A paper describes a structure:
Here, we report the atomic structure of an outer membrane spanning protein complex, MtrAB, that is representative of a protein family known to transport electrons between the interior and exterior environments of phylogenetically and metabolically diverse microorganisms. MtrAB is proposed to span the outer membrane and provide electrical connection between the catabolic electron transfer network within the cell, and the electron dispersing MtrC outside the cell (Edwards et al., 2018). Within this complex, the ten heme MtrC is the cell-surface module required when solid-phase minerals serve as terminal electron acceptors (Coursolle and Gralnick, 2010, Hartshorne et al., 2007). The Gram-negative Shewanella is one of the most studied bacterial genera capable of transferring electrons out of the cell to solid-phase Fe(III) and Mn(IV) minerals in order to support anaerobic respiration (Beblawy et al., 2018, Edwards et al., 2018).
To aid initial model building for the Mtr complex, an X-ray crystal structure was obtained for a soluble form of S. baltica OS185 MtrC (MtrCsol). The structure of the monomeric MtrCsol was similar to that of MtrC from S. oneidensis MR-1 described previously (Edwards et al., 2015). MtrCsol consists of 4 domains: two split beta-barrel domains, domains I and III, and two α-helical domains, domains II and IV. These domains serve as a scaffold for 10 bis-His coordinated hemes arranged in a “staggered cross” formation (Edwards et al., 2015). The three MtrCsol monomers within the asymmetric unit of the crystal displayed domain I/II movements relative to domains III/IV. These domain movements centered round a hinge region formed by residues 289–300 located within the alpha helix linking domains II and III. The location of the hinge point suggests this range of motion would not be restricted in the Mtr complex, giving conformational flexibility to MtrC.
Author numbering: 46 to 650
């Protein structure tokens, strides 16, 4: 009813005719009786090297038959009324026009169970199953082609049904069997197509082979990614090489020699080297910062560089290697009151100060006890949350390989661990933004753990435990994105609302247009709806403001699409600063809306 579990009991080829017997149960192992529509496919696997030295294993797709109990069925389908079924193909494999059936080769039968309901009305989910067997005894074959696991693709896609063919196939093994030479066109074989669909994408985790190639119990042949080099497969990314013509490479007329030069150790290390280089550079320094508010409302910022063990070092040791040490200071971690530009409320803009640029100290920056010190302009310190000033800090070093090097004109650079510091004018404990609803760990599956956020026009920010100030239910440090509000203020970024700069909207906007984002749980462990109590209005266009719940939901929902309207609910859409802020705690949305990350559309009627 929710899950279909297929357990195969007998799978053989009898004089060229494939036959399969299997049992179907649901999630709680209850027999499923009365299945109505299923498609059966047959294939066989050419072993590694069989078509030529160095050639990969290769599926041969005999074809498929669709069985509808209420209509046509080419084969013989038997419902034994206890959860056990049998299907005997109409096909004889010896009669295949393109493939030479060989009863010594490993065989495979695949099943797609359609979502046709049982006769009593019970709903059936679309399902995939497959079995691998030797033709005569039906036992497990001695060779296979299980390289990638559906779980790896699901890290980004959640369900492979989303990517092609109207949701028919959710098991990657089903894709890899059909996507083979002789069935799809040249270039559509799976060892070529998936490379070509990702090699030109910016998403961070795709820069590593391990995003699809890792150890998995469902993928015994997973090591083939470095051990089976082939002209077609390696050339799927190296598309400008012509091995037959010897262009961009010595001439290779076949695959017989690739592995003699391209041993798996070398292939693995050279494709994992840049990521491993970046990790070795990032591990080399840390940062500890302090922020102390003064009587004249200025704030003293002290930044100490640490070594790999966490011990402070004299910042002059590494100064000539610092490309940019970037700091941003704001007030009010739970709702910043300094805009990116001057706020309509405080009249104050965030303090953006580089401490070091191209190895040179900047104005007002001094070395004291090997630490970096800078005094900010006067800040709009106030009561409550506005007693706390906070600074988000990025550090970009010049690097080569696994080492920090002095900065030159064309030097490569690496973003280091970002730092987040808090301070007060009163001297009481600082306030801090909530982090209990967005955990940066959920970002790393798509973006990797070396996400250099805003590398390019900024120093770059790598989010680690270095910015953590809370622990989760299991005592593990929470890495939050709360530092980002230093620039993503309620008043926007540089366009003062025209780009919906506020962090409450910014990630919804940029991800609302991405197909791989489909559920709130891809970033949310929870919703902190209480945080709206401490929010004012957000700038949703240049100089115009919107009550905070409405501003958040309208990141993705056009305001006019909300049928019940917003005037009756206490909200203001692109109004005056004071007007919108006056109505900020008048929104009635949560009297009816009870969103959870799993289903945020829940309403109390
Ligand atoms: C994150 C690092 C990903 C992993 C792991 C896998 N895929 Fe992917 N895929 C990803 C992105 C960002 C895109 C761009 C298209 C989009 O807007 O989503 C894709 C694209 C594809 C496609 C192209 C057709 C499509 O539906 O987009 C295919 C056929 C595809 N992906 C399949 C696929 C398979 C089989 C994977 C496991 C081997 C897999 N993807 C992993 C992101 C990521
Ligand atoms: C046979 C029953 C198939 C299975 C199972 C899967 N695919 Fe498929 N796909 C198939 C064909 C015949 C074609 C047309 C290509 C041709 O030879 O003319 C496709 C097409 C695609 C494409 C687009 C190809 C391109 O644009 O270059 C993609 C990206 C694709 N298929 C991906 C894909 C995935 C992710 C599958 C598992 C969910 C999958 N295919 C299964 C045949 C069959
Ligand atoms: C997979 C479903 C993702 C999750 C989980 C997260 N992000 Fe994402 N993000 C994803 C895609 C496909 C894109 C488009 C850009 C691309 O590389 O294709 C983005 C975009 C961003 C950006 C834009 C700037 C950039 O570097 O591209 C940022 C800053 C960003 N995402 C941050 C981010 C955060 C903080 C996440 C956890 C809360 C997160 N992403 C998760 C895919 C996915
Ligand atoms: C997901 C987007 C992938 C990324 C990232 C990388 N590879 Fe891949 N690879 C992927 C698929 C879906 C397949 C085909 C699996 C099948 O059953 O057909 C492959 C295959 C290979 C192979 C061939 C293995 C063989 O024929 O036995 C090799 C040698 C290979 N991949 C190498 C490789 C490298 C070096 C990568 C990083 C640079 C890499 N892959 C990334 C999917 C994905
Ligand atoms: C010894 C004579 C080799 C044989 C046989 C094969 N390869 Fe090769 N290859 C070899 C070297 C010394 C290099 C350069 C390595 C470097 O770090 O500079 C290469 C290069 C490649 C590449 C990358 C090409 C590029 O990036 O422009 C690929 C994709 C490649 N080789 C694949 C490959 C294949 C498929 C082979 C069998 C047909 C093969 N190599 C054989 C050395 C040798
Ligand atoms: C000031 C130095 C900033 C810091 C700190 C952060 N961001 Fe930023 N970001 C900044 C500007 C001026 C802009 C362009 C205008 C706009 O608001 O869109 C951005 C943009 C983004 C985006 C949108 C995609 C893009 O154009 O890059 C995203 C998704 C984004 N920023 C995310 C983000 C995160 C997660 C941050 C904390 C690690 C962060 N930004 C900090 C300026 C600044
Ligand atoms: C990652 C790309 C996200 C996706 C997917 C969704 N949300 Fe989100 N949300 C994200 C960030 C970075 C923030 C800001 C955190 C902060 O400190 O300000 C938010 C915030 C919200 C809120 C505010 C309440 C809170 O917990 O802070 C709400 C109510 C919210 N987001 C709703 C929401 C819904 C309904 C989503 C699915 C459609 C959803 N978010 C996805 C990042 C991401
Ligand atoms: C992008 C990350 C979104 C945010 C932020 C919010 N919603 Fe959403 N919503 C989103 C999608 C992609 C969908 C499904 C497609 C559709 O547009 O219907 C929804 C759906 C809803 C629904 C149910 C559909 C309906 O017609 O009522 C509701 C009731 C809903 N959304 C409400 C809602 C609220 C109250 C939000 C702020 C807390 C909110 N959404 C944010 C995308 C996104
Ligand atoms: C009870 C009277 C509600 C109040 C108060 C608010 N919302 Fe609502 N909303 C309610 C229901 C039962 C539905 C679903 C019916 C529909 O026509 O969609 C909605 C719908 C939304 C949506 C999605 C609209 C769509 O996608 O078609 C959004 C984005 C939304 N509601 C937001 C929202 C806001 C911002 C509110 C406070 C200003 C608010 N709702 C109050 C019920 C009720
Ligand atoms: C897609 C991703 C692929 C796949 C399928 C192959 N390679 Fe590799 N390769 C790829 C990239 C993006 C780079 C640049 C370095 C990196 O960022 O990882 C390389 C580099 C190489 C090199 C380095 C030397 C050179 O480029 O001349 C070699 C020798 C190389 N690639 C060979 C190679 C082999 C043998 C492959 C099949 C096992 C192969 N590549 C596949 C991206 C990709
Ligand atoms: Ca810290
Ligand atoms: Ca803006």
């Amino acid at each position: 009813i929710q899950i279909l579990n297929f357990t195969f009991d007998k799978s053989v080829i009898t004089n060229g005719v494939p036959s399969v017997e299997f049992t179907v149960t649901n999630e709680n192992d209850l027999p499923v009786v009365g299945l109505q529509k299923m498609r059966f496919a047959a294939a066989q696997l050419i072993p590694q090297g069989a078509t030529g030295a160095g050639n990969a294993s290769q599926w041969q797709y005999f074809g498929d038959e669709t069985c509808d109990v209420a209509a046509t069925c080419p084969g013989t389908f038997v419902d034994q009324k206890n959860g056990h079924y049998s299907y005997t193909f109409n096909m004889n494999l010896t009669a295949n026009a393109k493939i030479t059936y060989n009863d010594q080769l490993a065989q495979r039968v695949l099943i797609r169970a359609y979502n046709t309901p049982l006769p009593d009305g019970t709903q059936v989910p679309n399902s995939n199953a497959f079995v691998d067997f030797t033709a005569d005894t039906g036992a497990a074959p001695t060779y296979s082609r299980k390289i990638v696991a559906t779980e790896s693709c699901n890290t980004c896609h959640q369900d492979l049904a989303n990517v092609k063919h109207g949701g028919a196939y959710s098991d990657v093994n089903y894709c890899a069997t059909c996507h083979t030479a002789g069935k799809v066109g040249v270039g559509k074989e799976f060892n070529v197509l998936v490379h070509a669909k990702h090699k030109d994408l910016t998403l961070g985790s795709l820069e590593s082979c391990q995003s699809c190639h890792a150890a998995n119990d469902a993928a015994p042949d997973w090591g083939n990614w470095s051990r089976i080099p082939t002209a077609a497969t390696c050339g799927s990314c190296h598309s400008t090489v012509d091995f037959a013509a010897g262009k961009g490479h010595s001439q290779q007329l076949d695959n017989s020699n690739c592995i003699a030069c391209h041993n798996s150790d070398w292939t693995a290390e050279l494709h994992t080297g840049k990521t491993a280089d970046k990790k070795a550079v990032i591990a080399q320094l840390g940062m500890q910062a302090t922020l102390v508010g003064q009587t004249d409302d200025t704030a003293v910022l002290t930044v100490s560089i640490l070594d790999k063990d966490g011990n402070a070092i004299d910042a002059a040791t590494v100064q000539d290697k610092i490309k940019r040490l970037e700091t941003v200071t704001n007030v009010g971690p739970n709702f910043p009151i300094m805009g990116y530009n001057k706020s309509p409320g405080s009249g104050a803009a965030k303090i953006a100060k580089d401490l070091v640029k191209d190895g040179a100290l900047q104005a007002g920056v001094t070395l004291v006890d090997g630490k970096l010190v800078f005094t900010t302009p006067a800040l709009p310190f106030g009561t409550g949350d506005t007693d706390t000033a906070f600074t988000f800090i990025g550090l970009e070093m010049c690097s080569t390989g696994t080492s920090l090097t002095a900065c030159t004109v064309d030097s490569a650079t690496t973003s280091m661990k970002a730092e987040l510091a808090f301070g007060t004018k009163s001297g009481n404990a600082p306030s801090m933004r909530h982090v209990n609803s967005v955990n940066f760990s959920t970002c790393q599956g798509c973006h990797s753990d070396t996400f250099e956020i805003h590398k390019g026009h900024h120093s770059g920010f790598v989010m680690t435990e270095q910015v953590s100030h809370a622990k989760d239910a299991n005592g593990k440090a929470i890495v939050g994105v709360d530092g980002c509000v230093a620039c993503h203020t309620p008043d926007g970024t540089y366009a003062s609302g025209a780009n919906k700069g506020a962090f409450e909207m910014k990630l919804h906007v940029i991800h609302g247009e991405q197909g791989v984002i489909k559920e709130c749980t891809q970033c949310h462990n929870d919703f902190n709806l209480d945080a709206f109590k401490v929010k004012g209005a957000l700038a949703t266009s240049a100089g115009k403001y919107t009550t905070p719940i409405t501003a958040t939901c309208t990141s993705c929902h056009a305001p006019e699409s909300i049928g019940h309207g917003l005037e009756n609910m206490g909200a203001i859409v692109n109004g005056d600063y004071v007007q919108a802020n006056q109505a900020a705690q008048s929104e009635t949305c949560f009297y009816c809306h009870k969103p959870t990350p799993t289903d945020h559309t829940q309403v109390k009627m």
